[PDB]
Curated annotation (Swiss-Prot):
It is linked to A chromosomal aberration involving HMGA1 is found in pulmonary chondroid hamartoma. Translocation t(6;14)(p21;q23-24) with RAD51B. This is High mobility group protein HMG-I/HMG-Y. Transmembrane segments: none annotated. The lineage of its organism: Eukaryota, Metazoa, Chordata, Craniata, Vertebrata. Constitutively phosphorylated on two or three sites. Hyperphosphorylated at early stages of apoptosis, followed by dephosphorylation and methylation, which coincides with chromatin condensation. Isoforms HMG-I and HMG-Y can be phosphorylated by HIPK2. Interacts with HIPK2. HMG-I/Y bind preferentially to the minor groove of A+T rich regions in double-stranded DNA. It is suggested that these proteins could function in nucleosome phasing and in the 3'-end processing of mRNA transcripts. They are also involved in the transcription regulation of genes containing, or in close proximity to A+T-rich regions.
DNA sequence: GGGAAATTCCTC
DNA sequence: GAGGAATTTCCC
C-alpha cells in the first residue's frame, strides 16, 4: 500500500 | 556510533 | 505528466 520514504532493504 | 545514498511522495 | 523535496537504511 503506502511505502514510507527510505532506502531499500538489503 | 557517524557519514553518505536511494527511493518515495507531493506540487504545478 | 515530469520534477523537486523529504525520510530511512547501510557499511566500517
Amino acid at each position: 500500500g503506502r511505502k514510507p520514504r527510505g532506502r531499500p532493504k538489503k
